[PDB]
Amino acid sequence: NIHKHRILILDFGSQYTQLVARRVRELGVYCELWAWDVTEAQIRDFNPSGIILSGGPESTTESPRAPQYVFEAGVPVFGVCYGMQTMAMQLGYAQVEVVNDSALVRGIEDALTADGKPLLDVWMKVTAIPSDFITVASTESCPFAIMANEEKRFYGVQFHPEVTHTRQGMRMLERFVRDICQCEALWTPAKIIDDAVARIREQVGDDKVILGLSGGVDSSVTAMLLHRAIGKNLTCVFVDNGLLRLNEAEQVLDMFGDHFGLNIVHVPAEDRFLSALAGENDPEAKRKIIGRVFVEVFDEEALKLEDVKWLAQGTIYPDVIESAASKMGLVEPLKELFKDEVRKIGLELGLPYDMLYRHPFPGPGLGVRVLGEVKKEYCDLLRRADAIFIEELRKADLYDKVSQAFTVFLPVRSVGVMGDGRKYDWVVSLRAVETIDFMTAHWAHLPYDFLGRVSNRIINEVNGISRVVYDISGKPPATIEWE
Amino acid sequence: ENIHKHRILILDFGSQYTQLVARRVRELGVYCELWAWDVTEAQIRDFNPSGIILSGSPRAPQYVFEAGVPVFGVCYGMQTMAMQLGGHVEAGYAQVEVVNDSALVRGIEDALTADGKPLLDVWMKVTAIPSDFITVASTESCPFAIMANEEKRFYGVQFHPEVTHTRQGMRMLERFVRDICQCEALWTPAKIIDDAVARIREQVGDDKVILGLSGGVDSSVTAMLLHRAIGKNLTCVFVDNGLLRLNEAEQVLDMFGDHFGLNIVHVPAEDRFLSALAGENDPEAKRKIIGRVFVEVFDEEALKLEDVKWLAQGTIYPDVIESAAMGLVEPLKELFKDEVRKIGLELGLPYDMLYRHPFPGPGLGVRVLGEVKKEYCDLLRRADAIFIEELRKADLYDKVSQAFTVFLPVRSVGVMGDGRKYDWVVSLRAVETIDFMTAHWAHLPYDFLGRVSNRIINEVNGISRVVYDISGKPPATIEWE
Amino acid sequence: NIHKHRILILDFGSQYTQLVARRVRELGVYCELWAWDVTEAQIRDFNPSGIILSGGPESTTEENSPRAPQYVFEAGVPVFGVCYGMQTMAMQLGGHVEASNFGYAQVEVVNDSALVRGIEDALTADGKPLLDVWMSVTAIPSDFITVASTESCPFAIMANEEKRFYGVQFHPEVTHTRQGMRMLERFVRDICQCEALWTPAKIIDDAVARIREQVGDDKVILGLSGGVDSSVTAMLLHRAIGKNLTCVFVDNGLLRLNEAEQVLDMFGDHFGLNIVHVPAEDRFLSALAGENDPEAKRKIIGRVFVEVFDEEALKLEDVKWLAQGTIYPDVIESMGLVEPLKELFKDEVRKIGLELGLPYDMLYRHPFPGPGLGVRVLGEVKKEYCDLLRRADAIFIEELRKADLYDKVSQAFTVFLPVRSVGVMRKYDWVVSLRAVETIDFMTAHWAHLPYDFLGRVSNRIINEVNGISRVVYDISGKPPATIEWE
Amino acid sequence: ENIHKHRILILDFGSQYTQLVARRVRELGVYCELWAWDVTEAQIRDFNPSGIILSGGPESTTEENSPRAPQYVFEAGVPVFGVCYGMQTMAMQLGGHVEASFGYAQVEVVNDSALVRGIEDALTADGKPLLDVWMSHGDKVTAIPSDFITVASTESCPFAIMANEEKRFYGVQFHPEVTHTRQGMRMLERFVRDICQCEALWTPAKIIDDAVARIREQVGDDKVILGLSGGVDSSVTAMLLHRAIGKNLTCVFVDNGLLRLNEAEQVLDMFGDHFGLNIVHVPAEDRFLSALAGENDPEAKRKIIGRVFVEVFDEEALKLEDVKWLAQGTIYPDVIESMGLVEPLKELFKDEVRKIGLELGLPYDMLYRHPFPGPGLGVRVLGEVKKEYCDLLRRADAIFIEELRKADLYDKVSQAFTVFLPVRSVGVMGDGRKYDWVVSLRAVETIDFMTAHWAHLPYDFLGRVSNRIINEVNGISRVVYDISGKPPATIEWE
Numbered sequence A: 001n002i003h004k005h006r007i008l009i010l011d012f013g014s015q016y017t018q019l020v021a022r023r024v025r026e027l028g029v030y031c032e033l034w035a036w037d038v039t040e041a042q043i044r045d046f047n048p049s050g051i052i053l054s055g056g057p058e059s060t061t062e063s064p065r066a067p068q069y070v071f072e073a074g075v076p077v078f079g080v081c082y083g084m085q086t087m088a089m090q091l092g093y094a095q096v097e098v099v100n101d102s103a104l105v106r107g108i109e110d111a112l113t114a115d116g117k118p119l120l121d122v123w124m125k126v127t128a129i130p131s132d133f134i135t136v137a138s139t140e141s142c143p144f145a146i147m148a149n150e151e152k153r154f155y156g157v158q159f160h161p162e163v164t165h166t167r168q169g170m171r172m173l174e175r176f177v178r179d180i181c182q183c184e185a186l187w188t189p190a191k192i193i194d195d196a197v198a199r200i201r202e203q204v205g206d207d208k209v210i211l212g213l214s215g216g217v218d219s220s221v222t223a224m225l226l227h228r229a230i231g232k233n234l235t236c237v238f239v240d241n242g243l244l245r246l247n248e249a250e251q252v253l254d255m256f257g258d259h260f261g262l263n264i265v266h267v268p269a270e271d272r273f274l275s276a277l278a279g280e281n282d283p284e285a286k287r288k289i290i291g292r293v294f295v296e297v298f299d300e301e302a303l304k305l306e307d308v309k310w311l312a313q314g315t316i317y318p319d320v321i322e323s324a325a326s327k328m329g330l331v332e333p334l335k336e337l338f339k340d341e342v343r344k345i346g347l348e349l350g351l352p353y354d355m356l357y358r359h360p361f362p363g364p365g366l367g368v369r370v371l372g373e374v375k376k377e378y379c380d381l382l383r384r385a386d387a388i389f390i391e392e393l394r395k396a397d398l399y400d401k402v403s404q405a406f407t408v409f410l411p412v413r414s415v416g417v418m419g420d421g422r423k424y425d426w427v428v429s430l431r432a433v434e435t436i437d438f439m440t441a442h443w444a445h446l447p448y449d450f451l452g453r454v455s456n457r458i459i460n461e462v463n464g465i466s467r468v469v470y471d472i473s474g475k476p477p478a479t480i481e482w483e
Numbered sequence B: 001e002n003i004h005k006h007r008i009l010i011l012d013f014g015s016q017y018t019q020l021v022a023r024r025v026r027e028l029g030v031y032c033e034l035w036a037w038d039v040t041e042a043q044i045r046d047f048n049p050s051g052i053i054l055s056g057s058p059r060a061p062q063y064v065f066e067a068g069v070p071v072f073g074v075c076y077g078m079q080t081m082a083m084q085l086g087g088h089v090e091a092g093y094a095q096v097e098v099v100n101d102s103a104l105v106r107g108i109e110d111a112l113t114a115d116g117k118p119l120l121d122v123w124m125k126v127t128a129i130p131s132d133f134i135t136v137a138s139t140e141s142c143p144f145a146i147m148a149n150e151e152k153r154f155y156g157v158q159f160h161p162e163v164t165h166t167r168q169g170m171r172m173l174e175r176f177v178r179d180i181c182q183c184e185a186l187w188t189p190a191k192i193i194d195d196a197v198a199r200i201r202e203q204v205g206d207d208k209v210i211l212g213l214s215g216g217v218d219s220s221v222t223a224m225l226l227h228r229a230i231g232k233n234l235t236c237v238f239v240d241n242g243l244l245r246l247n248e249a250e251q252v253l254d255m256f257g258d259h260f261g262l263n264i265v266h267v268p269a270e271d272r273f274l275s276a277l278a279g280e281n282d283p284e285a286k287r288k289i290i291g292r293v294f295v296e297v298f299d300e301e302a303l304k305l306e307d308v309k310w311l312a313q314g315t316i317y318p319d320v321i322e323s324a325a326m327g328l329v330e331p332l333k334e335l336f337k338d339e340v341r342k343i344g345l346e347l348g349l350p351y352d353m354l355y356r357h358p359f360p361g362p363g364l365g366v367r368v369l370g371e372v373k374k375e376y377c378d379l380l381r382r383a384d385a386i387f388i389e390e391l392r393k394a395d396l397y398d399k400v401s402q403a404f405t406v407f408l409p410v411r412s413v414g415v416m417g418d419g420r421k422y423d424w425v426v427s428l429r430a431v432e433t434i435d436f437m438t439a440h441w442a443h444l445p446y447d448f449l450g451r452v453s454n455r456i457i458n459e460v461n462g463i464s465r466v467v468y469d470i471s472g473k474p475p476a477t478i479e480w481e
Numbered sequence C: 001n002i003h004k005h006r007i008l009i010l011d012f013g014s015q016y017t018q019l020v021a022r023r024v025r026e027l028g029v030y031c032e033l034w035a036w037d038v039t040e041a042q043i044r045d046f047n048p049s050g051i052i053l054s055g056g057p058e059s060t061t062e063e064n065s066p067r068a069p070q071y072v073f074e075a076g077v078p079v080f081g082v083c084y085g086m087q088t089m090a091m092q093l094g095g096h097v098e099a100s101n102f103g104y105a106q107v108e109v110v111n112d113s114a115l116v117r118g119i120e121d122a123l124t125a126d127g128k129p130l131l132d133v134w135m136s137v138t139a140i141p142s143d144f145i146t147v148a149s150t151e152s153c154p155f156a157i158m159a160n161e162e163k164r165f166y167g168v169q170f171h172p173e174v175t176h177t178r179q180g181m182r183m184l185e186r187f188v189r190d191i192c193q194c195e196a197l198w199t200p201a202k203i204i205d206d207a208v209a210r211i212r213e214q215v216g217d218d219k220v221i222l223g224l225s226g227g228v229d230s231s232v233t234a235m236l237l238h239r240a241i242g243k244n245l246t247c248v249f250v251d252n253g254l255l256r257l258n259e260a261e262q263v264l265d266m267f268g269d270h271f272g273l274n275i276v277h278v279p280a281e282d283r284f285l286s287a288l289a290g291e292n293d294p295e296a297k298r299k300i301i302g303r304v305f306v307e308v309f310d311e312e313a314l315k316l317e318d319v320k321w322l323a324q325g326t327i328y329p330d331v332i333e334s335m336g337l338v339e340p341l342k343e344l345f346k347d348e349v350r351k352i353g354l355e356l357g358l359p360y361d362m363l364y365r366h367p368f369p370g371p372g373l374g375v376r377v378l379g380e381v382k383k384e385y386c387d388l389l390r391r392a393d394a395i396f397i398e399e400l401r402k403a404d405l406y407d408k409v410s411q412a413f414t415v416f417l418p419v420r421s422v423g424v425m426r427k428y429d430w431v432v433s434l435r436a437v438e439t440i441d442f443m444t445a446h447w448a449h450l451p452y453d454f455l456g457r458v459s460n461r462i463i464n465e466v467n468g469i470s471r472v473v474y475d476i477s478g479k480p481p482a483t484i485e486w487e
Numbered sequence D: 001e002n003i004h005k006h007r008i009l010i011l012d013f014g015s016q017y018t019q020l021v022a023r024r025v026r027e028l029g030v031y032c033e034l035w036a037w038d039v040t041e042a043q044i045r046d047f048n049p050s051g052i053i054l055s056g057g058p059e060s061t062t063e064e065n066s067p068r069a070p071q072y073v074f075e076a077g078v079p080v081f082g083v084c085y086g087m088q089t090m091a092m093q094l095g096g097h098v099e100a101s102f103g104y105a106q107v108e109v110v111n112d113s114a115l116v117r118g119i120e121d122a123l124t125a126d127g128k129p130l131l132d133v134w135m136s137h138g139d140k141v142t143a144i145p146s147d148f149i150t151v152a153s154t155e156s157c158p159f160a161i162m163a164n165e166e167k168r169f170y171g172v173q174f175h176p177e178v179t180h181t182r183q184g185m186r187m188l189e190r191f192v193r194d195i196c197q198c199e200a201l202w203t204p205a206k207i208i209d210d211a212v213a214r215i216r217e218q219v220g221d222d223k224v225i226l227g228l229s230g231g232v233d234s235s236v237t238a239m240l241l242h243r244a245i246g247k248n249l250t251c252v253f254v255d256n257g258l259l260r261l262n263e264a265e266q267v268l269d270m271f272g273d274h275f276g277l278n279i280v281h282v283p284a285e286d287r288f289l290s291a292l293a294g295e296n297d298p299e300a301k302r303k304i305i306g307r308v309f310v311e312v313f314d315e316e317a318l319k320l321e322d323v324k325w326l327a328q329g330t331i332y333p334d335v336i337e338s339m340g341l342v343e344p345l346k347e348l349f350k351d352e353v354r355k356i357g358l359e360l361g362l363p364y365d366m367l368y369r370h371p372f373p374g375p376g377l378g379v380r381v382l383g384e385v386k387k388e389y390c391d392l393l394r395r396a397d398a399i400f401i402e403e404l405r406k407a408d409l410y411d412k413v414s415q416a417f418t419v420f421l422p423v424r425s426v427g428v429m430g431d432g433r434k435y436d437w438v439v440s441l442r443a444v445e446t447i448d449f450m451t452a453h454w455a456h457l458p459y460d461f462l463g464r465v466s467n468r469i470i471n472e473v474n475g476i477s478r479v480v481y482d483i484s485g486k487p488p489a490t491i492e493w494e
């Protein structure tokens, strides 16, 4: 069983904790990210084959600490940054000299040299280890780079193995998870899919399941999962909310109605969304509106069915994790998956690459990209602008060099040449970013020649657009979307 | 000493480069005028040129060749020179081989051929030259790249010598205007100033003159010329319309009031222009209001002054050329824009001010899209200041023709400590201008753009997001309105 | 057994054929790359779980052109034809090719096949599956179905599902084929039903087992160069027969700075190997004395090293085995012989070297030629020239690594130029040349467009810091018309 | 016409920018001489400057033996302009005081001075005039002499400009001669044309006319020989003498086998078949190669080439009866660095030589060619000079320059050439290999006599040239690029 060998990752608040989880996932082992403030009851219920304590911005000199069971549970424990500093007490690029044999790092040598010692290229106080620990690696600024009670199988590392900059970090996480915690590598996209199917089948039986099909990654893979498990019993509602991209409805239907043979209720709700949105300039109002009409449309569509006892949903593990930060049943095949696993299993389920590695598209769609009041003519204009932008972006092989690209409609009038020189028309902003984390994203240094080709195209080819600007504001101090 | 004694008639055959040719002639210190090609024997005879230039189916007046003065045809001018004297015409860097001796290019060599023959590096068609002309230079594509009737002192070149791409073009221009045409170079900043003062004094005498002092290049140099000519008898009216750059009023007042001793009437009229603009969204109406309120204010101040008999004005020669179908002092009406700067330097004005990017008459009124409001103008001024501050630090101010900031009355979200706040967006706009019809948006460095947008969003309370106008002209325009 | 599931890959002459092989290896499945001109007895003896017929430049329309042995299609195993492999399978099975004396291409999947079922990169506006492939046939066999199409290429993919014959006109082995690896995975793991036992941990365990069966308690001589193959080899025999393995490391005086100290400290003082160290600097130098001919120097360096190695070998009799780092590419291009790496490709040797415990930086270090500095010192090889070269090269590589440029080139090194150049406090000293290449194939190398300020930095460090070097130049000559080494 | 009548004395205190001052004043149309600071009142009285400019320098007036102007500088009754050090020694030598301590800066003008009245680059917010100047942040005047006034200042430079308006003494802590001082030229012109009242009679056309007249009055109708090398200096000298004494000028062009590809023909085609000079063309390639045979020492090679050049020239001289005059192209920098002698360019800087060269009819690209050393390929062929090597180098170099001109990179460098390395490398030949010579491309952006940076030529450009030389020149296996700056290396390899 694929959840059997499982890592409990305890989050002391690093931005890299989910990266550790994703690395364990990549290594083929289930794992779970909980907050540090967990009860020995819970760790005993999860029953981890090993524990991992993640980095932290706090300090053990105040203060987040592991539930003492972490070290009493008799499973190998791996501390990382804070997780190492908290393992003690409770018991930029750099190179560490391996000063001892440890289970964790034996055989793993990036450079050696030192003339008589193994070196580790790692990506990086602890004044003294517990009495049962040895020093395993050391640096100038950190004599305690790796510490280990190799008998109790506790390991401590002042660097981040989950990050690629740690030359052999993954081999180290492999060592801890596969070899020191003797975990089998059962958590494979093929076997996740079988687990998904089995669990949906068992949880829903012959009951009818409904699902909001966006065409996006999460609800698509969910569609494919539900569909593989209960076939025709699944009904997907595709709402064209009048806020999608150019031809999005066609593409979602060509893909999932035709190509994959899904049972699709197609709801053309453009006028209805644009109705409810009428005269609404407040971006948070628009979101709530757009989100409410969606819930309205699905509940209407659900009733037109019958015996629909289950709503399916593209909830992925990160979503569960924020919810962790404090009618119809829920079918959530992806609740345990991170986004890269979802894509990977989407590939195995047969979905196309393009869709799976597409830029995220917001729920509210163009509703948050038409500044202020959302009008059809602004959305049609926005659509042709985005289409050109994204089509040029794809020609130039720039689509994968940015996390997200789109255009924003500015309801301001600017003059542009018409032939005699007298036509005001609308302005759009191109927006392209390289996303670093949920808090920070850089605006993309798209090439000048390229920007200008897109500019000219949008202005010349779209009647109603006279001027194109580029969002040159990063996040912070701005955000990715304009609303 | 008439600095207009030696003069060059340049006939404009519609080329972009014709005002370039005239400026080159003015750079050699020789006065010249640029007329439309369609002139009369009479119009030309009255000018009495020391030499005629024809720029790049229109035809020169037959008198141009009858006039007995040297004539220089460039591109279309050389082609039209061939047509009209019995030749024949049929329609990038290049090198023309000089194949005959000619006053125009005698001694002007850029390289030598393998044969050992002279070559000209030029920037650029005739198939038969008149029977009294010879072939001066040629190249593979252009059999007749330079031709000359050495006797009538007629010279045609297919390339443009006014463009520095023609390696020694200026020297051929110098050769025709100074040697062939027999011109002294008295047209100098210092002497143009003297002649401007002389002509102002003679036309105005002891009368008091009034002047609209916009702070721009033209009205400033006009102000300094008048102040030099008539001093206390000059009142400049400076009108802060509410649409000027940050501290423009203080700056113009500092400069001409305290520093230069001009007599200034400062009209703080921000509320007045803003109020005449309240609610107006149409840029055509905004400009008309701003212009309308401008003369109203200026008229109300001209009636506030005893014995004002003359209006001074920074009309420059291109304004005169562009104009092609109380007394008026226009000291700059013969000067091209760079000449006006050169003399503004000799009159003691500051370089920064003379080479400043042009600012439009309505100012921020065409840069706050829609209803111009004080709030938006305030934000715009701060953002714009940060932009130019940085442009100058980066030595990029020199590198664009115009750089400014447009206020977009759209709300965008941005970070506000731990959460979010909606505020206004501005667009940076920077162009390299090419002509009245053509401008490329500047490829400002990315790092620089990032600094500026950070500076604006972080430093300007009320701005959350900054975009860069990446639209060229055409299909867009330089200004947003 | 980790060779049980195995893919026979027949080589029809493509450049990318070794890449097909290594992708099967990357997949976790043993495979073998043979010339196409083999026999049924050979295939039968090999017992493929599946056969891949790879690309090739020749035309199927020519007179005596390559054909797959007819048994390929009678082995009752799956057959995968890639490009010419597919053109030969179509021609050998009833269909036709027209001849025509590369590119990115999107092929539309127009029918189901086990090979590309569910492998999609995009949809057409008409809902049809698209594959992003690295492209390169007028009729297919009449038991074959068309699987995918292009404009240019009507039969991009053909297949006989019953017989498990799949032909593609693109290169799944090339990363440009977006889901190439998946199709190869599909063929090998799903269709050929191979397990992924070909792993580094298991290839090591296999290596050890096969050394012990072959050698037992016998004694084994090895030439330890510190290079990648000789060293992983040493680790395998050592993990296999400990003290019964002896490593002869000859410091020929033509090695990089402190190479002897480093080879010895690492494999003797850290991996507990038993190494006889021939400190043979003066002997190689004496032999090379007065030889300005690169060909003659290569010989001389070869001759002496054999002489030295033989002498050290005789000195430990009752040794019946010479071990050697020969790797699978050596096999493909070509006391008793022990060769643990003879089935491994270079990146496997590296991968298993990491499992053996070896340092990354050593396993991914640039190749250092047999003659070492004997061929990087133009003309007469002298102690002093090698000495300057070693200091110069050490500076170059040190800068090159801290600039994170070692990853970015195939080979970086310094060549000593016996020419005098003026420099400042005015002195005449030697010239060295930096040389850094990006090696496309065996015959093509681009000189690296190393940053200018980096080049200027390396260049100043070498001049200022190496007493004896007045001037640094950079080889801006690619292969062809020049070669990688200078001699 | 006396075109030297007005003249500025520049006293060199050692600034890297002193030559620039001299050329700016020249550019303004006013003759000027550049002397060392330690000259004598006597010498200055002889020159009789219309005005004196004291340049900057690296020394410090606060140090014991620091350079000072001849006191007469301040007693000659002419305007004195002091630039940095010259300002600081003007202060100190007049009762000021300097304290011991380059960049852009804005000096605020605070008093009227003939030097900068009307010269303004910006204003302060407070509305006060600013000059944009290129300053030396080093030593600073902290007291100005009694009858001086502060003209300009910064928060860090109380006396950024000082002036004694009556004595026409001006000191600036910045460099008006460098472009980075926005209106420095106008400052220099203000001093030279206005305050010193120099007429701008030092123009190319007038310099020519003056040279001619000085030639025609030094030699009259005598015969004059001239080593013509096609280099800028002797070419301009040749044309001066041609216009001056015409037929009596005999030009000797020596092809020493160390010239660039076809150089003899293009020099012959140019100055013989086109400009009409009388060229005695000596083909002495075998004579130089012979004398050079077996000489691997670059210092010996240079002496040999020098010596052998002189014998050839003396012989050609002997073949002409009554050669009473030797013309050379010595330019003023050669004087500053240091048969009757005619040196028409001894007062001219290199740009002035080009400028008058163009006025004489010489082609631009010749006048602006990179400097070619006197020994030619003999110091670009490393070790022993042989014809096979020079033929190679010539072919290789001409490819180099041809491409360099094509890509508009020729004028982006001060010198570009190829060095023949007597080292052999292997290369591809067909399917097998070949073994042939190596050449080095060498290209520099020269900043001064002691500083050259190697050019960041475009990689694709380098590889194109690379391939061309190797694929087009027989005898070359490989091309390298010199990536050594000067210092620690030199421009030439030998």
Ligand SMILES: O=c1[nH]c(=O)c2[nH+]cn([C@@H]3O[C@H](COP(=O)(O)O)[C@@H](O)[C@H]3O)c2[nH]1
Binding pocket: A287, A360, A361, A362, A363, A364, A368, A404, A475, A479, A480, A481, A482, A483
């Ligand atoms: O499903 C969604 N509903 C929303 O209302 C929404 N708002 C922002 N986003 C996405 O969140 C990411 C970060 O955008 P911001 O930096 O503007 O917050 C980007 O990926 C945005 O597209 C949304 N997604």
Ligand SMILES: O=c1[nH]c(=O)c2[nH+]cn([C@@H]3O[C@H](COP(=O)(O)O)[C@@H](O)[C@H]3O)c2[nH]1
Binding pocket: B287, B358, B359, B360, B361, B362, B366, B402, B473, B476, B477, B478, B479, B480
């Ligand atoms: O004095 C002015 N009053 C105006 O109303 C005006 N509108 C445009 N401009 C200037 O014209 C140039 C380019 O015009 P466009 O904005 O139409 O491209 C640029 O120099 C613009 O600033 C104006 N100048």
Ligand SMILES: O=c1[nH]c(=O)c2[nH+]cn([C@@H]3O[C@H](COP(=O)(O)O)[C@@H](O)[C@H]3O)c2[nH]1
Binding pocket: C298, C367, C368, C369, C370, C371, C375, C411, C479, C483, C484, C485, C486, C487
């Ligand atoms: O082990 C070796 N012994 C040798 O004698 C030898 N010669 C060249 N090389 C390597 O061959 C590759 C290309 O060399 P060339 O382009 O100079 O032929 C590069 O990888 C060179 O290092 C050698 N390797």
Ligand SMILES: O=c1[nH]c(=O)c2[nH+]cn([C@@H]3O[C@H](COP(=O)(O)O)[C@@H](O)[C@H]3O)c2[nH]1
Binding pocket: D371, D372, D373, D374, D375, D379, D415, D486, D490, D491, D492, D493, D494
């Ligand atoms: O050594 C030389 N002998 C000569 O006869 C000679 N003539 C000119 N040049 C130029 O002088 C400069 C100095 O060269 P270095 O950077 O190698 O010292 C470089 O600019 C050289 O080209 C010569 N150099």
